[PDB]
Short mmCIF file of C-alpha atoms and ligand atoms in Angstrom, two decimals:
data_model
loop_
_atom_site.label_atom_id
_atom_site.label_comp_id
_atom_site.label_asym_id
_atom_site.label_seq_id
_atom_site.Cartn_x
_atom_site.Cartn_y
_atom_site.Cartn_z
CA UNK A 1 -67.90 60.11 6.11
CA UNK A 2 -64.66 59.84 7.40
CA UNK A 3 -61.43 61.10 5.35
CA UNK A 4 -59.01 58.31 4.34
CA UNK A 5 -56.95 56.96 6.78
CA UNK A 6 -54.58 59.20 8.08
CA UNK A 7 -56.49 62.24 7.20
CA UNK A 8 -58.72 64.90 8.41
CA UNK A 9 -62.03 65.48 8.06
CA UNK A 10 -64.32 68.48 9.23
CA UNK A 11 -65.06 67.59 12.61
CA UNK A 12 -68.79 69.06 13.56
CA UNK A 13 -70.17 68.55 16.46
CA UNK A 14 -74.42 69.59 16.60
CA UNK A 15 -76.18 69.70 20.35
CA UNK A 16 -79.50 67.50 20.51
CA UNK A 17 -81.80 70.01 22.97
CA UNK A 18 -82.95 72.80 21.29
CA UNK A 19 -81.27 71.95 17.69
CA UNK A 20 -81.66 68.58 16.89
CA UNK A 21 -84.76 67.50 19.79
CA UNK A 22 -87.66 69.99 20.51
CA UNK A 23 -87.15 70.57 24.09
CA UNK A 24 -88.94 73.51 24.48
CA UNK A 25 -91.54 72.65 22.85
CA UNK A 26 -92.61 69.00 24.19
CA UNK A 27 -91.57 70.89 27.80
CA UNK A 28 -94.40 73.21 27.30
CA UNK A 29 -96.26 70.90 25.66
CA UNK A 30 -96.31 67.97 28.75
CA UNK A 31 -96.39 70.92 31.33
CA UNK A 32 -99.47 72.23 30.21
CA UNK A 33 -101.03 68.92 30.32
CA UNK A 34 -99.86 68.20 33.91
CA UNK A 35 -100.28 71.23 35.27
CA UNK A 36 -103.23 72.13 33.33
CA UNK A 37 -104.20 74.96 36.02
CA UNK A 38 -101.07 76.56 35.99
CA UNK A 39 -99.79 79.90 34.18
CA UNK A 40 -96.90 78.97 31.74
CA UNK A 41 -95.21 80.76 29.10
CA UNK A 42 -95.88 80.78 25.18
CA UNK A 43 -92.66 80.01 23.87
CA UNK A 44 -92.64 83.47 21.59
CA UNK A 45 -92.20 85.03 25.75
CA UNK A 46 -89.33 82.84 26.06
CA UNK A 47 -86.51 84.46 28.04
CA UNK A 48 -83.32 83.21 29.15
CA UNK A 49 -81.71 79.77 28.60
CA UNK A 50 -83.23 78.28 31.82
CA UNK A 51 -86.87 77.39 31.79
CA UNK A 52 -87.45 76.65 35.59
CA UNK A 53 -86.04 80.34 36.50
CA UNK A 54 -88.33 81.95 33.84
CA UNK A 55 -91.02 79.66 35.97
CA UNK A 56 -89.98 79.99 39.10
CA UNK A 57 -90.68 84.04 38.24
CA UNK A 58 -93.83 83.45 37.15
CA UNK A 59 -95.29 82.03 40.33
CA UNK A 60 -94.02 80.59 43.28
CA UNK A 61 -93.65 76.90 43.24
CA UNK A 62 -93.37 76.64 39.37
CA UNK A 63 -89.80 76.28 38.68
CA UNK A 64 -89.77 72.51 40.98
CA UNK A 65 -93.43 71.71 38.48
CA UNK A 66 -91.28 72.59 35.37
CA UNK A 67 -88.38 70.32 36.47
CA UNK A 68 -90.58 67.52 37.31
CA UNK A 69 -91.10 67.45 34.02
CA UNK A 70 -87.56 67.10 32.58
CA UNK A 71 -86.82 64.59 35.70
CA UNK A 72 -89.35 62.23 33.78
CA UNK A 73 -89.25 59.01 31.97
CA UNK A 74 -89.78 59.44 28.23
CA UNK A 75 -89.40 62.67 28.40
CA UNK A 76 -85.89 63.20 26.19
CA UNK A 77 -87.05 60.04 24.79
CA UNK A 78 -90.30 61.10 22.96
CA UNK A 79 -88.77 65.07 22.57
CA UNK A 80 -89.93 65.75 18.31
CA UNK A 81 -87.18 66.52 16.18
CA UNK A 82 -87.28 70.24 15.01
CA UNK A 83 -88.32 70.22 11.18
CA UNK A 84 -85.11 69.63 9.21
CA UNK A 85 -82.97 68.00 11.73
CA UNK A 86 -83.49 64.71 10.98
CA UNK A 87 -82.50 65.18 7.24
CA UNK A 88 -79.89 67.62 7.41
CA UNK A 89 -77.96 65.56 9.95
CA UNK A 90 -78.00 61.97 7.68
CA UNK A 91 -77.24 64.67 5.07
CA UNK A 92 -74.00 66.34 6.28
CA UNK A 93 -72.81 62.97 7.72
CA UNK A 94 -72.93 61.42 3.97
CA UNK A 95 -70.62 64.42 2.75
CA UNK A 96 -67.15 63.21 1.97
CA UNK A 97 -64.51 64.27 4.63
CA UNK A 98 -67.38 65.28 6.88
CA UNK A 99 -67.52 64.07 10.26
CA UNK A 100 -70.02 64.39 12.57
CA UNK A 101 -70.39 64.02 16.04
CA UNK A 102 -74.11 64.78 18.29
CA UNK A 103 -72.33 65.97 21.59
CA UNK A 104 -74.77 67.10 24.42
CA UNK A 105 -75.03 66.75 27.70
CA UNK A 106 -77.55 65.40 30.33
CA UNK A 107 -79.22 66.10 32.95
CA UNK A 108 -77.40 65.48 36.57
CA UNK A 109 -80.76 63.75 37.19
CA UNK A 110 -79.15 60.68 35.15
CA UNK A 111 -81.53 57.96 35.95
CA UNK A 112 -83.05 58.38 32.10
CA UNK A 113 -82.11 60.91 30.60
CA UNK A 114 -78.73 59.22 28.92
CA UNK A 115 -80.37 56.16 28.08
CA UNK A 116 -82.92 57.92 26.42
CA UNK A 117 -80.77 59.78 24.56
CA UNK A 118 -78.83 57.57 22.99
CA UNK A 119 -82.52 55.07 22.40
CA UNK A 120 -83.59 58.63 20.35
CA UNK A 121 -80.74 58.85 17.89
CA UNK A 122 -81.27 54.88 17.07
CA UNK A 123 -84.91 55.76 17.00
CA UNK A 124 -84.01 58.46 14.02
CA UNK A 125 -80.94 57.80 12.53
CA UNK A 126 -80.33 54.45 13.60
CA UNK A 127 -77.93 51.96 14.99
CA UNK A 128 -74.95 52.35 13.49
CA UNK A 129 -74.81 56.05 14.09
CA UNK A 130 -75.01 55.66 17.94
CA UNK A 131 -71.15 55.71 17.47
CA UNK A 132 -71.61 59.41 17.31
CA UNK A 133 -72.65 59.91 20.58
CA UNK A 134 -70.52 62.34 22.77
CA UNK A 135 -72.21 63.03 26.20
CA UNK A 136 -70.47 65.59 28.01
CA UNK A 137 -71.20 68.36 30.45
CA UNK A 138 -68.09 69.94 29.16
CA UNK A 139 -68.00 70.73 25.52
CA UNK A 140 -64.61 72.85 25.84
CA UNK A 141 -63.24 69.72 25.45
CA UNK A 142 -64.44 68.34 22.78
CA UNK A 143 -62.29 69.44 20.09
CA UNK A 144 -63.68 70.15 16.51
CA UNK A 145 -64.35 73.14 13.80
CA UNK A 146 -67.84 73.87 14.53
CA UNK A 147 -70.28 73.67 17.29
CA UNK A 148 -73.94 73.90 16.77
CA UNK A 149 -75.88 75.10 19.36
CA UNK A 150 -78.61 76.88 21.37
CA UNK A 151 -76.96 77.95 24.06
CA UNK A 152 -74.98 81.51 24.47
CA UNK A 153 -72.58 80.82 26.81
CA UNK A 154 -70.60 77.49 26.31
CA UNK A 155 -68.30 77.39 28.94
CA UNK A 156 -65.31 74.79 30.74
CA UNK A 157 -62.61 73.49 31.47
CA UNK A 158 -60.62 74.37 27.92
CA UNK A 159 -60.06 78.23 27.95
CA UNK A 160 -59.54 78.17 23.92
CA UNK A 161 -61.76 75.42 22.63
CA UNK A 162 -61.23 74.83 19.25
CA UNK A 163 -64.45 74.74 17.83
CA UNK A 164 -66.13 77.78 16.15
CA UNK A 165 -69.37 77.73 18.17
CA UNK A 166 -72.41 78.45 15.42
CA UNK A 167 -75.37 79.87 17.48
CA UNK A 168 -78.49 77.64 16.90
CA UNK A 169 -81.44 80.03 16.90
CA UNK A 170 -84.28 79.10 19.29
CA UNK A 171 -87.12 81.18 20.90
CA UNK A 172 -85.05 81.88 23.83
CA UNK A 173 -81.79 83.33 22.05
CA UNK A 174 -83.58 84.35 18.77
CA UNK A 175 -83.43 88.38 20.42
CA UNK A 176 -79.89 88.44 21.31
CA UNK A 177 -77.07 90.04 19.82
CA UNK A 178 -73.76 88.76 19.45
CA UNK A 179 -70.37 90.19 19.56
CA UNK A 180 -69.30 90.17 16.00
CA UNK A 181 -67.95 87.82 14.18
CA UNK A 182 -70.40 85.44 16.19
CA UNK A 183 -72.91 83.96 13.95
CA UNK A 184 -76.35 81.98 13.76
CA UNK A 185 -78.00 79.09 12.00
CA UNK A 186 -81.79 80.40 12.14
CA UNK A 187 -83.31 76.50 11.09
CA UNK A 188 -82.03 73.26 9.62
CA UNK A 189 -84.21 75.41 6.23
CA UNK A 190 -80.72 78.21 6.74
CA UNK A 191 -78.17 77.10 5.03
CA UNK A 192 -76.11 74.63 6.94
CA UNK A 193 -74.08 73.66 4.23
CA UNK A 194 -72.70 77.38 3.39
CA UNK A 195 -71.10 77.37 6.75
CA UNK A 196 -69.45 74.34 6.98
CA UNK A 197 -67.58 75.17 3.72
CA UNK A 198 -66.28 77.97 4.73
CA UNK A 199 -63.94 76.17 7.67
CA UNK A 200 -63.13 73.68 5.20
CA UNK A 201 -59.28 73.89 3.54
CA UNK B 1 -59.57 71.13 40.65
CA UNK B 2 -60.04 74.18 38.13
CA UNK B 3 -57.29 76.49 37.62
CA UNK B 4 -58.17 80.46 38.43
CA UNK B 5 -60.62 81.55 35.03
CA UNK B 6 -58.85 81.91 31.98
CA UNK B 7 -55.92 79.72 32.97
CA UNK B 8 -55.42 76.08 32.15
CA UNK B 9 -55.10 73.12 34.55
CA UNK B 10 -53.50 70.07 33.42
CA UNK B 11 -56.23 68.03 31.31
CA UNK B 12 -55.89 63.77 32.46
CA UNK B 13 -59.13 61.40 31.01
CA UNK B 14 -59.57 58.38 32.99
CA UNK B 15 -60.78 55.43 31.25
CA UNK B 16 -63.20 53.13 33.23
CA UNK B 17 -63.28 49.71 32.32
CA UNK B 18 -60.00 47.98 33.17
CA UNK B 19 -58.96 51.31 34.48
CA UNK B 20 -61.41 51.59 37.86
CA UNK B 21 -64.17 49.64 37.76
CA UNK B 22 -62.26 45.81 37.34
CA UNK B 23 -64.63 44.80 34.18
CA UNK B 24 -61.87 41.56 33.89
CA UNK B 25 -62.45 40.13 37.74
CA UNK B 26 -66.17 41.27 36.71
CA UNK B 27 -66.79 39.54 34.19
CA UNK B 28 -65.21 35.98 35.12
CA UNK B 29 -66.96 36.56 38.07
CA UNK B 30 -70.27 36.64 36.08
CA UNK B 31 -69.19 34.04 33.71
CA UNK B 32 -68.09 31.23 35.86
CA UNK B 33 -71.50 31.19 38.21
CA UNK B 34 -73.47 31.82 34.81
CA UNK B 35 -71.66 29.02 33.25
CA UNK B 36 -70.19 26.59 35.79
CA UNK B 37 -70.32 23.31 33.28
CA UNK B 38 -68.32 25.97 30.68
CA UNK B 39 -63.95 26.60 30.66
CA UNK B 40 -63.43 30.16 31.44
CA UNK B 41 -59.98 31.74 30.73
CA UNK B 42 -58.46 32.55 34.30
CA UNK B 43 -57.04 36.21 34.16
CA UNK B 44 -53.30 35.16 33.98
CA UNK B 45 -54.04 33.91 30.52
CA UNK B 46 -56.36 37.12 28.99
CA UNK B 47 -54.56 37.84 25.56
CA UNK B 48 -56.18 39.88 23.38
CA UNK B 49 -58.65 43.26 23.87
CA UNK B 50 -61.77 41.13 23.49
CA UNK B 51 -62.58 38.88 26.10
CA UNK B 52 -65.20 37.09 22.84
CA UNK B 53 -62.55 37.16 20.94
CA UNK B 54 -60.68 34.64 23.25
CA UNK B 55 -63.71 32.83 24.56
CA UNK B 56 -65.38 32.09 21.08
CA UNK B 57 -61.69 30.01 20.20
CA UNK B 58 -62.24 28.18 23.59
CA UNK B 59 -65.47 26.56 22.30
CA UNK B 60 -67.93 26.87 19.69
CA UNK B 61 -70.77 29.37 21.18
CA UNK B 62 -68.85 31.10 23.75
CA UNK B 63 -68.26 33.76 22.47
CA UNK B 64 -72.31 34.86 22.35
CA UNK B 65 -72.35 33.47 26.56
CA UNK B 66 -69.30 36.15 27.10
CA UNK B 67 -71.23 38.58 25.44
CA UNK B 68 -74.58 38.04 27.08
CA UNK B 69 -72.78 38.82 30.59
CA UNK B 70 -72.04 42.15 29.83
CA UNK B 71 -75.09 42.81 28.05
CA UNK B 72 -76.78 41.68 31.50
CA UNK B 73 -78.94 44.29 34.02
CA UNK B 74 -75.92 45.46 36.91
CA UNK B 75 -72.90 44.03 34.96
CA UNK B 76 -71.31 47.66 35.21
CA UNK B 77 -73.21 48.58 37.75
CA UNK B 78 -71.68 45.95 39.87
CA UNK B 79 -68.34 46.18 38.49
CA UNK B 80 -65.50 46.21 41.79
CA UNK B 81 -63.69 49.47 41.27
CA UNK B 82 -59.91 48.58 41.27
CA UNK B 83 -57.31 48.41 44.31
CA UNK B 84 -56.27 52.55 44.69
CA UNK B 85 -58.93 53.68 41.79
CA UNK B 86 -61.05 55.85 43.72
CA UNK B 87 -58.85 56.98 46.13
CA UNK B 88 -55.88 58.25 43.29
CA UNK B 89 -58.98 59.86 41.71
CA UNK B 90 -60.13 61.90 44.76
CA UNK B 91 -56.58 62.82 44.72
CA UNK B 92 -56.45 63.76 41.77
CA UNK B 93 -58.59 65.81 41.42
CA UNK B 94 -57.88 67.45 44.33
CA UNK B 95 -54.95 68.94 43.14
CA UNK B 96 -54.37 72.02 42.27
CA UNK B 97 -54.55 72.98 38.09
CA UNK B 98 -55.64 69.02 38.18
CA UNK B 99 -59.11 68.53 36.04
CA UNK B 100 -59.54 64.87 35.43
CA UNK B 101 -62.69 63.79 33.54
CA UNK B 102 -63.89 60.10 33.90
CA UNK B 103 -63.72 59.18 29.63
CA UNK B 104 -65.18 56.28 28.96
CA UNK B 105 -66.98 54.15 26.27
CA UNK B 106 -70.40 52.66 26.39
CA UNK B 107 -71.21 49.25 24.39
CA UNK B 108 -73.80 49.38 21.84
CA UNK B 109 -76.14 47.69 23.48
CA UNK B 110 -77.52 51.02 25.21
CA UNK B 111 -80.44 50.01 27.70
CA UNK B 112 -78.02 49.93 30.88
CA UNK B 113 -74.44 51.12 30.21
CA UNK B 114 -74.93 54.34 30.11
CA UNK B 115 -76.55 54.74 33.13
CA UNK B 116 -74.88 51.96 35.09
CA UNK B 117 -71.54 53.72 34.43
CA UNK B 118 -73.25 57.53 35.89
CA UNK B 119 -74.52 55.90 38.56
CA UNK B 120 -71.67 53.64 39.32
CA UNK B 121 -69.60 57.09 39.80
CA UNK B 122 -72.46 58.95 41.74
CA UNK B 123 -71.51 55.60 44.35
CA UNK B 124 -67.69 56.26 44.20
CA UNK B 125 -67.69 59.82 43.65
CA UNK B 126 -70.14 61.41 45.08
CA UNK B 127 -73.44 63.66 42.94
CA UNK B 128 -70.26 66.64 42.00
CA UNK B 129 -68.22 64.32 40.06
CA UNK B 130 -70.62 63.41 37.80
CA UNK B 131 -69.81 66.68 35.36
CA UNK B 132 -66.37 65.22 35.04
CA UNK B 133 -67.74 61.92 33.28
CA UNK B 134 -67.84 61.86 29.33
CA UNK B 135 -68.35 59.39 27.83
CA UNK B 136 -67.54 58.61 24.11
CA UNK B 137 -67.06 55.79 21.60
CA UNK B 138 -64.19 57.81 20.25
CA UNK B 139 -61.39 59.46 22.68
CA UNK B 140 -59.86 60.61 19.83
CA UNK B 141 -61.71 63.95 19.82
CA UNK B 142 -61.25 64.92 23.15
CA UNK B 143 -58.20 67.32 23.84
CA UNK B 144 -56.01 66.73 26.91
CA UNK B 145 -52.94 66.41 28.23
CA UNK B 146 -52.90 62.62 29.60
CA UNK B 147 -55.45 59.66 28.83
CA UNK B 148 -55.12 56.34 31.18
CA UNK B 149 -56.56 53.59 29.05
CA UNK B 150 -55.54 49.92 29.26
CA UNK B 151 -56.53 49.44 25.75
CA UNK B 152 -53.27 49.52 23.72
CA UNK B 153 -54.05 50.77 20.48
CA UNK B 154 -56.32 54.10 20.35
CA UNK B 155 -58.26 55.54 17.39
CA UNK B 156 -60.37 57.46 15.63
CA UNK B 157 -60.98 60.56 14.06
CA UNK B 158 -58.46 62.93 14.91
CA UNK B 159 -55.00 62.11 13.86
CA UNK B 160 -53.35 63.91 16.07
CA UNK B 161 -54.53 63.66 19.32
CA UNK B 162 -53.26 66.30 21.83
CA UNK B 163 -53.21 63.27 24.58
CA UNK B 164 -50.07 61.52 25.80
CA UNK B 165 -51.70 57.97 25.95
CA UNK B 166 -50.41 55.86 29.35
CA UNK B 167 -51.01 52.52 28.69
CA UNK B 168 -52.44 50.99 32.04
CA UNK B 169 -51.39 47.54 33.11
CA UNK B 170 -53.95 44.53 32.85
CA UNK B 171 -54.01 40.90 32.40
CA UNK B 172 -54.92 41.32 28.10
CA UNK B 173 -51.60 44.01 28.17
CA UNK B 174 -48.96 43.03 30.66
CA UNK B 175 -46.76 41.50 28.40
CA UNK B 176 -46.39 44.26 25.58
CA UNK B 177 -44.04 45.20 24.45
CA UNK B 178 -44.71 49.30 23.45
CA UNK B 179 -43.32 51.26 20.70
CA UNK B 180 -40.55 54.34 22.47
CA UNK B 181 -41.34 56.36 24.48
CA UNK B 182 -45.22 54.96 24.96
CA UNK B 183 -45.07 54.60 28.97
CA UNK B 184 -47.43 52.88 31.46
CA UNK B 185 -48.97 53.22 34.66
CA UNK B 186 -48.89 49.55 36.16
CA UNK B 187 -51.52 50.38 38.25
CA UNK B 188 -52.77 52.80 41.06
CA UNK B 189 -50.30 52.33 43.63
CA UNK B 190 -47.61 53.10 40.74
CA UNK B 191 -46.31 56.48 41.23
CA UNK B 192 -49.16 58.38 38.52
CA UNK B 193 -48.34 61.72 40.45
CA UNK B 194 -44.95 61.70 38.40
CA UNK B 195 -46.84 61.23 34.95
CA UNK B 196 -48.97 64.37 35.72
CA UNK B 197 -46.05 66.30 36.59
CA UNK B 198 -43.99 65.13 34.37
CA UNK B 199 -47.09 66.69 31.48
CA UNK B 200 -47.05 70.36 33.07
CA UNK B 201 -45.62 73.44 32.53
O1 2O2 C 301 -82.30 74.44 27.54
C1 2O2 C 301 -82.09 74.15 28.01
N1 2O2 C 301 -83.64 74.75 29.16
C2 2O2 C 301 -83.34 74.65 30.19
O2 2O2 C 301 -84.21 75.21 30.94
N2 2O2 C 301 -82.65 73.01 30.95
C3 2O2 C 301 -82.94 72.53 31.76
C4 2O2 C 301 -82.36 71.19 32.53
C5 2O2 C 301 -81.75 71.19 33.31
O3 2O2 C 301 -80.50 70.94 32.97
C6 2O2 C 301 -79.84 70.94 33.84
C7 2O2 C 301 -78.04 71.52 32.69
C8 2O2 C 301 -77.01 72.13 33.06
C9 2O2 C 301 -76.57 72.04 32.21
C10 2O2 C 301 -75.72 71.13 31.02
C11 2O2 C 301 -77.08 70.05 30.74
C12 2O2 C 301 -78.62 70.27 31.68
P1 2O2 C 301 -79.44 69.94 35.13
O4 2O2 C 301 -78.71 68.98 34.77
O5 2O2 C 301 -78.39 70.75 35.63
O6 2O2 C 301 -80.12 69.78 35.57
O7 2O2 C 301 -79.95 72.96 34.41
C13 2O2 C 301 -80.91 73.43 34.65
C14 2O2 C 301 -81.76 72.50 33.86
O8 2O2 C 301 -82.72 73.20 33.18
C15 2O2 C 301 -81.53 72.34 30.03
C16 2O2 C 301 -81.67 73.04 28.23
C17 2O2 C 301 -80.74 71.96 27.46
C18 2O2 C 301 -79.42 71.77 27.44
P2 2O2 C 301 -78.30 71.76 27.20
O9 2O2 C 301 -78.85 71.32 25.04
O10 2O2 C 301 -77.84 69.82 26.93
O11 2O2 C 301 -77.03 72.16 26.47
O1 2O2 C 302 -62.15 45.94 27.63
C1 2O2 C 302 -62.37 45.28 27.28
N1 2O2 C 302 -62.67 43.63 26.80
C2 2O2 C 302 -64.02 43.44 26.35
O2 2O2 C 302 -63.98 42.75 26.00
N2 2O2 C 302 -64.76 44.07 26.08
C3 2O2 C 302 -65.92 43.90 25.74
C4 2O2 C 302 -67.20 44.47 25.95
C5 2O2 C 302 -68.14 44.71 24.53
O3 2O2 C 302 -67.35 46.09 24.11
C6 2O2 C 302 -67.69 46.61 22.98
C7 2O2 C 302 -66.74 47.41 22.77
C8 2O2 C 302 -66.37 48.76 21.32
C9 2O2 C 302 -65.57 49.52 21.59
C10 2O2 C 302 -65.96 50.28 22.71
C11 2O2 C 302 -66.41 49.89 24.42
C12 2O2 C 302 -66.86 48.68 24.30
P1 2O2 C 302 -69.18 46.46 21.98
O4 2O2 C 302 -70.08 47.98 22.27
O5 2O2 C 302 -68.85 47.09 20.27
O6 2O2 C 302 -70.03 45.02 22.19
O7 2O2 C 302 -66.73 45.11 21.91
C13 2O2 C 302 -66.89 44.16 22.44
C14 2O2 C 302 -67.46 43.95 23.51
O8 2O2 C 302 -65.92 43.93 24.33
C15 2O2 C 302 -64.72 45.99 26.12
C16 2O2 C 302 -63.63 46.21 27.19
C17 2O2 C 302 -63.59 47.75 27.57
C18 2O2 C 302 -64.02 48.86 27.27
P2 2O2 C 302 -63.11 50.34 27.38
O9 2O2 C 302 -62.48 50.25 28.41
O10 2O2 C 302 -64.80 51.12 27.73
O11 2O2 C 302 -62.73 50.96 26.34
MG1 MG C 303 -79.22 72.44 23.33
MG1 MG C 304 -60.90 50.35 29.31
#
């Protein structure tokens, strides 16, 4: 909930894909359904942020087939929420002096993706939560106390972002050793409130 | 153009409606075409940021008719650029140590608007410029040196934004007296380079 006027609430940016929405699981399900004669990468075996790069190493042509999955209509809209993600963000947004923004990047092929992300937030969080969406390809220019995001390396035009990046665990990053004092949120069942409280005055 | 790595380019946020895209002219054209038996508000006579409020005072029911114009498919996509706007932003983005983001708010009815804004930027600035788009309902959480925006009062969750807000003249704000030391950009023919240079080291 917002601070009283002129005041300063703790501000938390929450990524969508891989944090709220199950991109990896959705991808694999739809890939196997569309391309059942192709090999695939079990989640346990995912390595590197970029799905298509790993698929491209697995067999020639597979990078382009992978890309076609997330370029398809309804791919983003039909992603299932991560366990605990909707409940956690609803709780988080209800906390005093706590402003939560869903800060997500659309893919370059814009025909479906931005629309479906707004539709997905409406679906799970309601119409009033649409006020909390920020779409950007550069998160470093969005100011906040915390950024919860599954991507290990978040870069952009601001060399010294104001947020602390808390790495949200995903199949593709779960084995990564981080430079101290970088930290993780393992899942929404993990203690996200302790992380927020650590940044409060 | 971006700064060399680790470095800090001047960062300029540019609004879309009323700054790059002619919302007021597009609105009036389509309103008159759809509702030719209704009275309308000539641009010279526009007062207050909110079109529908002024229309609602003009005749009962007209606020809802106004709203229907910007909720229609192709309303945003078919907006014409302001004179000089495309050329200015292309030049601005080409300048050394200058990072330009188009920072715009989608309307609440998300079916067409976000998509059409990305399509409009592709159309006028090209595919690579899609990297520079930020969609947000809160510009105060986007950090920059300058925000060029026709809305007089820009507020949100950050009580002390990092940008200086430069008011872009529009029919609805042209008579407004601003609190010193707030300033204006009258049009894209006005000297925007002097404004940027005033913020450089
Ligand atoms: O984790 C991911 N893994 C992944 O393989 N992808 C796919 C989807 C598509 O996304 C992009 C992408 C790059 C940067 C930011 C968002 C998406 P593109 O828009 O360039 O096609 O990069 C290549 C592709 O990779 C996206 C994501 C998630 C992106 P985020 O959660 O929005 O930051
Ligand atoms: O100048 C304007 N005048 C105007 O009458 N409107 C119309 C369009 C619609 O926009 C909204 C609006 C409110 C805040 C930010 C963007 C749009 P809504 O999403 O709530 O329907 O407010 C009421 C409506 O008013 C928008 C704008 C421009 C908004 P901006 O350039 O994106 O900041
Ligand atoms: Mg992600
Ligand atoms: Mg505007």
